[PDB]
């Protein structure tokens, strides 16, 4: 493994995040005071049948040297479940691939959540047409990270310092 960390988004630079939604639901994103400097506020309104998400498509799919993904999250002031997602690259030249999820719940205080890659679970509610269907998370072949819906409720949260974590020392 690599030793240390590799920052994906501290939210001090290029706005890397797009939004998507369907069937009633909405999400919008903006820059605000984050955990250090600036972070990204996420506002959503869930629907029963609908969906919402914010997405970064990474310029590098090769994550196999690292052990965890980490980020700082906080709710803006009621508590509601969301999902953080890793998606592999498509096998058919279009769209994304196999979706890997971890549930989290922002609260009134800042929390650093560090998820081992081996604690992600394969998404059970949806897979895209482009998936490898391997049942494995292939860390040499990552397309995109997301924050996205878990339910039909509404909420607000702020994220900051999204990074990869390696080993402690050589
Ligand atoms: O056929 C009989 C009856 O059907 C009813 O309709 C059904 C239909 O059959 C079901 O298929 C449908 O199921 C939906 C399901 O489709 C929906 O899936 C979501 C999924 O949850 C989201 O995660 C996914 O989000 C993607 C975005 O769309 C996409 O824009 C975004 O793309 C990313 C880019 O923005 C980015 O720049 O780059 C990325 C990669 O480089 C890129 O991919 O990606 C995200 C993630 O992939 O969207 C899909 C929807 O498109 O999930 C919902 C929630 O459960 C299901 O409901 O259900 C309908 C019923 O509502 C007919 O209505 C009926 O008449 C027929 O009889
Ligand atoms: Ca920051
Ligand atoms: Ca796979």
Nearest CA to ligand 1 atom 7: 49
Give the Å distance between the CA of 38 and the centre of ligand 2: 4
Nearest CA to ligand 1 atom 41: 57
How many beta carbons lie within 10 A of that of residue 16, not counting itself? 17
Start-to-end Cα distance in the chain: 9
Q: Which ligand gives the minimal distance to the CA of 93?
A: 1
Give the Å distance between the CA of 118 and the centre of ligand 1: 26
Cα–Cα distance for residue pair 82/124, rounded to 1 Å: 15
Cα–Cα distance for residue pair 19/34, rounded to 1 Å: 19
Cβ atoms 158, 3 nearer than 8 A: no
Candidate from 20, 82, 130, 148 with most ligand 1 atoms within 8 A of CB, to mutate = 20
Cα–Cα distance for residue pair 129/131, rounded to 1 Å: 6
**Containing domain of residue 141, as a range?**
1-168
Strands (E), 58-153: 68-75, 82-89, 96-104, 111-116, 121-122, 142-149
In 37-101, which ranges are continuous DSSP H helix? none
Q: Which ligand gives the minimal distance to the CA of 158?
A: 2
CATH number at residue 3: 2.60.120.430
Cβ atoms 40, 18 nearer than 8 A: no
Q: Which of 27, 33, 18 lies closest to 159, judged by CA?
A: 33
Tell which atom from ligand 1 comes closest to the C-alpha of 57.
41
Q: Which ligand gives the minimal distance to the CA of 36?
A: 2
Cβ atoms 151, 80 nearer than 8 A: yes
Cα–Cα distance for residue pair 42/149, rounded to 1 Å: 11
The method of structure determination was X-ray
Residues 6+ apart with CB under 8 A from 128: 87, 90, 95, 96, 97, 99
The number of domains in the chain is 1
- Indicate the Cα dihedral angle 61, 117, 153, 28, nearest 10°: -30
Concatenating the DSSP letter of every residue in 149-166 gives ESSS-EEEEEEEEEEEE-
- Strand-pair partners of 74: 158
User: CA separation (Å) from 119 to 12, 84, 86, 96?
Assistant: 29, 12, 12, 21
Burial class of residue 153, CB neighbours in 10 A (0-12, 13-18, 19+): middle
Residues 6+ apart with CB under 8 A from 5: 70, 163, 164, 165, 166
Give the Å distance between the CA of 138 and the centre of ligand 3: 5
Q: How many residues does the chain have?
A: 170
């Amino acid at each position: 493994s690599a030793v240390g960390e590799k920052m994906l988004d501290d939210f001090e630079g290029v706005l890397n995040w797009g939004s998507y939604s369907g069937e009633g639901a909405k999400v919008s994103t903006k820059i605000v005071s984050g955990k250090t400097g600036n972070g990204m506020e996420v506002s959503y309104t869930g629907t029963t049948d609908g969906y919402w998400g914010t997405v970064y498509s990474l310029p590098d799919g090769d994550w196999s040297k690292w052990l965890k993904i980490s980020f700082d999250i906080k709710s803006v002031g009621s508590a509601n479940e969301i999902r953080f997602m890793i998606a592999e690259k498509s096998i058919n030249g279009v769209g994304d691939g196999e979706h890997w999820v971890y549930s989290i719940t922002p609260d009134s205080s800042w929390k650093t959540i560090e998820i081992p890659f081996s604690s992600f679970r394969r998404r059970l509610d949806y897979q895209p047409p482009g998936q490898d269907m391997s049942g494995t998370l292939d860390l040499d072949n990552i397309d995109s990270i997301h924050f996205m819906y878990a339910n039909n409720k509404s909420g607000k949260f702020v994220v900051d310092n999204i990074k990869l974590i390696g080993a402690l020392e050589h």
